[PDB]
Structures are given as structure tokens and as C-alpha cells.
């Protein structure tokens, strides 16, 4: 159901090594709003050797409405395919709204580590991301 308070969904990015810009999952509905996983390579000019995986949760970004807001908790996880006990996750808490409709980690993990076959996150050039999102009832959506 769309109005559920929480959900866990995964997003697998294929040909991960070739990613150059943000890739987005299809929407997953929680608390009557659409949520997406956004993944992108990131780097900063002062640390050109430290390219990272950027990993964000995005809420209701297809809307340009300035009225909506939704506070959510989430666990942002990259799945270790070799050992499910070696997956890596980091927690967030954020009021989502138009000006800040995503939240997560620009420097989630080093790109060189996620793409290292020996580390267990990448297989057949595929990396799987997962979000467990626990959202509050939104405001500014229903009349």
C-alpha cells in the first residue's frame, strides 16, 4: 500500500564502472509519496584522487510544489554480495521538502573500494544499493 509508514527497496546499478552522472531508481511509495535512490560518482578539485560514490535518498522530486514536506529516517546500505554480513550502511534523518528533496552522502564510500572486486560489493560490474525508509506522515499534500 502507498500509505505504509516504512519500506525497504533495492536498486541495482549495472555497468557501474561506466557511470558518469546520477542514475535514479523508479519510485517506491511510502507515506503516499514517491521515494528514489540516487547514485552518482563525485569528486572535488582539491582531492582528485578521492572520487567517491554519492548515495542519496530522494523524495517527491518530480513535484515542483513548495507546500509539501516529509520527515524521514533511513538506512542507506550498499550490499556486499560475497558476505551479507559485510554490507555497509549509514543512517540519516531529514526533513524533505522542495529545496532539500534529497539527503545522503556525497562521500558514501571511495569509488576505488566499491569497484574493487576483492572487496565484495561489485559483481559482473553490478552494485546493489538498498534503502530502509521510515517516513512520517507528510504535510502539504492532501487538501
Amino acid at each position: 500500500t502507498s500509505w505504509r509508514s516504512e519500506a525497504t527497496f533495492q536498486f541495482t546499478v549495472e555497468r557501474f564502472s561506466r557511470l558518469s552522472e546520477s542514475v535514479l531508481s523508479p519510485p517506491c511509495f511510502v507515506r503516499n509519496l514517491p521515494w528514489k535512490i540516487m547514485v552518482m560518482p563525485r569528486f572535488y578539485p582539491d582531492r582528485p584522487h578521492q572520487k567517491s560514490v554519492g548515495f542519496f535518498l530522494q523524495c517527491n522530486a518530480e513535484s515542483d510544489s513548495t507546500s509539501w514536506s516529509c520527515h524521514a529516517q533511513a538506512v542507506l546500505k550498499i550490499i556486499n554480495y560475497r558476505d551479507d554480513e559485510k554490507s555497509f550502511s549509514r543512517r540519516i534523518s531529514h526533513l524533505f521538502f522542495h529545496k532539500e528533496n534529497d539527503w545522503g552522502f556525497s562521500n558514501f564510500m571511495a569509488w576505488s573500494e566499491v569497484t574493487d572486486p576483492e572487496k565484495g560489493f561489485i559483481d559482473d560490474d553490478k552494485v546493489t544499493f538498498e534503502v530502509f525508509v521510515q517516513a512520517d506522515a507528510p504535510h502539504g499534500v492532501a487538501w
Binding site: 546520477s22 550502511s89 549509514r90 543512517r91 540519516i92 532539500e100 534529497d102 545522503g104 552522502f105 556525497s106
Partner: peptide, 15 residues
Amino acid sequence: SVWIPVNEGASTSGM
């Protein structure tokens, strides 16, 4: 084991 506090290093994407 989950130890790192919520939001450590968190931000918007800037997109």
C-alpha cells in the same frame, strides 16, 4: 554493528 551517529557526513546532493 551499527555505531556511527545519524547524519555523520550527510548533506543534500546539491543537484
